[PDB]
C-alpha cells in the first residue's frame, strides 16, 4: 500500500545539530522505504512546533518525531495526535512523558550533567573558581534537566566553585554572542563558561576571541563541524555531544517498529543496522514517575567527548 510518512521536527532549522539529525532520519527513511519529512520553525517557539504537529496530523502522517521547545506547550496537539492513532515520539528534548510514547534520548540528566562538570573540572583544576552557565532558555526541557544535575554535582563535588550567573541565548546567534560578550565583560573573575547548547557554545568561544579573553575554560555541547574552527584556534579544548546523525536514524527505526507493531514495552530491544541493539528503558531513567504500556525511553549507546585528537573523525 501507500508508503508510510513520518515527520521529523527540530527545535529550529538552520542549526547544524538539527540539520544533521534530520539527515540521519531521512537516510533511515530511505533504508526502510519510509517518506521522512524534515521540517521545523526558523526559530524555537511553541506556535512554530504546534502548527507543524497539527498540520502533519491533519495531513494523515503516520508518525511524528519532535524535539520539544517546552515540556507542556505541545501537549494539546500531541494528545490529539495520539487520540487519532498517530505515533508520537520525542527526540533530543522531551515533553512530559504522558504527551508522547517514546523519547529517543542522548543520555540521562545524570550522565549529561556529569559530562559538563567533568569537562569543566579537567580544565579549571582548582578548588576555588567562578563559573557561568549559558544555554538556550529557562523553559526548554532537555537543557534544564541537565543543568539541574550539573548544578547539584558542582554544589556537592566542587564546593569552592561559585556559579556567578546563568544566562540565555534563545538559539539565536546574534543574541547568544551579545549575551556571551556581556558575561565575559561583567565577570572578569571567571574561570569557566558551561554552555550545554549548540548555539551558546560557539557564541561563548567567539565572544572570548572578540574580547581577547585568555585562560577561560569554555565547555559545553555542540557539533563538530560548528566547533572545529574554535578547537583549531584553541579557544575550546574540549566539548561533548553524541552521534546526532545516529540519533535521527534511531528515532526513525523506533517509529518504524511501532508502525510494524513490534514489541516495544520497557525491557524490549530492537536491532538497527550499524548500531546493534537499542533497548526501551523506563521513564524513571530521566527522573519521571510515569509508566504505561507502549511508553518509555530509548537511550543512545554512547556519548562522545571531542577534542583536537578526534574532532576530524566526525562530519556532522
Ligand X SMILES: C[C@@]1(O)OC[C@H](O)C1(O)O
Binding site for ligand X (CB under 6 A): 11, 17, 67, 92-93, 142-143, 196-198, 221
309 CB-contact burial (10 Å; exposed 0-12 / middle 13-18 / buried 19+): exposed
For ligand X, the closer of residues 13 and 31 by Cβ is 13
> Of the candidates 140, 146, 131, which has an alpha carbon nearest to the alpha carbon of residue 196?
146
> By the 8 A CB rule, do 227 and 244 touch?
no
Minimum CB separation from ligand X for residue 94, in Å? 11
Minimum CB separation from ligand X for residue 168, in Å? 13
- Number of other CB atoms surrounding residue 311 within 10 Å: 18
For ligand X, the closer of residues 24 and 264 by Cβ is 24
The CA distance from 203 to 135, in Å, is: 10
Minimum CB separation from ligand X for residue 11, in Å? 5
Minimum CB separation from ligand X for residue 92, in Å? 5
Half-sphere exposure of 203 (CA within 13 A, CB side): 29
Minimum CB separation from ligand X for residue 205, in Å? 15
The Cα angle at residue 93 between residues 89 and 96, in degrees rounded to 5: 65
How large is the C-alpha radius of gyration of the chain?
19
DSSP assignment of 99-115 = G-SEEEES--HHHHHHH
Residue least distant from ligand X (Cβ)? 198
Cell 556571551 belongs to which residue?
Answer: 180
Minimum CB separation from ligand X for residue 271, in Å? 26
Amino acid at each position: 500500500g501507500s508508503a508510510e510518512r513520518i515527520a521529523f521536527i527540530p527545535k529550529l532549522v538552520g542549526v547544524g545539530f538539527f540539520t544533521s539529525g534530520g539527515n540521519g532520519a531521512q537516510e533511515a527513511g530511505k533504508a526502510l522505504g519510509i517518506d521522512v519529512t524534515y521540517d521545523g520553525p526558523t526559530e524555537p517557539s511553541v506556535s512554530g512546533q504546534v502548527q507543524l504537529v497539527n498540520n502533519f496530523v491533519n495531513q494523515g502522517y503516520d508518525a511524528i518525531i519532535v524535539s520539544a521547545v517546552s515540556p507542556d506547550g505541545l501537549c494539546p496537539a500531541l494528545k490529539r495526535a495520539m487520540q487519532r492513532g498517530v505515533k508520537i515520539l520525542t527526540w533530543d528534548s522531551d515533553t512530559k512523558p504522558e504527551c508522547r510514547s517514546y523519547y529517543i534520548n542522548q543520555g540521562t540528566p545524570k550522565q549529561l550533567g556529569s559530562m559538563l562538570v567533568e569537562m569543566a573540572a579537567h580544565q579549571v583544576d582548582k578548588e576555588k573558581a567562578k563559573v557561568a552557565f549559558f544555554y538556550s532558555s529557562p523553559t526548554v526541557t532537555d537543557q534544564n534537566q541537565w543543568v539541574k544535575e550539573a548544578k547539584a554535582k558542582i554544589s556537592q563535588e566542587h564546593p569552592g566553585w561559585e556559579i556567578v550567573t546563568t544566562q540565555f541565548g534563545y538559539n539565536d546567534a546574534t543574541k547568544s554572542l551579545q549575551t556571551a560578550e556581556g558575561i565575559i565583560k561583567a565577570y572578569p573573575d571567571l574561570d569557566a563558561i558551561i554552555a550545554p547548547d549548540a548555539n551558546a557554545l560557539p557564541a561563548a568561544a567567539q565572544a572570548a576571541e572578540n574580547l581577547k579573553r585568555n585562560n577561560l575554560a569554555i565547555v559545553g555541547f555542540s557539533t563538530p563541524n560548528v566547533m572545529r574552527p574554535y578547537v583549531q584556534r584553541g579557544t575550546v579544548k574540549e566539548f561533548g555531544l553524541w552521534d546526532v546523525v545516529q540519533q535521527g536514524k534511531i528515532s526513525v527505526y523506533v517509529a518504524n517498529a511501532l508502525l510494524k507493531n513490534m514489541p516495544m514495552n520497557v525491557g524490549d530491544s530492537l536491532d538497527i543496522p550499524g548500531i546493534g541493539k537499542v533497548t526501551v528503558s523506563p521513564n524513571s531513567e530521566q527522573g519521571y514517575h510515569y509508566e504505561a504500556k507502549g511508553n518509555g525511553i530509548v537511550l543512545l549507546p554512547e556519548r562522545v567527548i571531542f577534542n583536537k585528537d578526534n574532532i576530524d573523525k566526525y562530519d556532522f
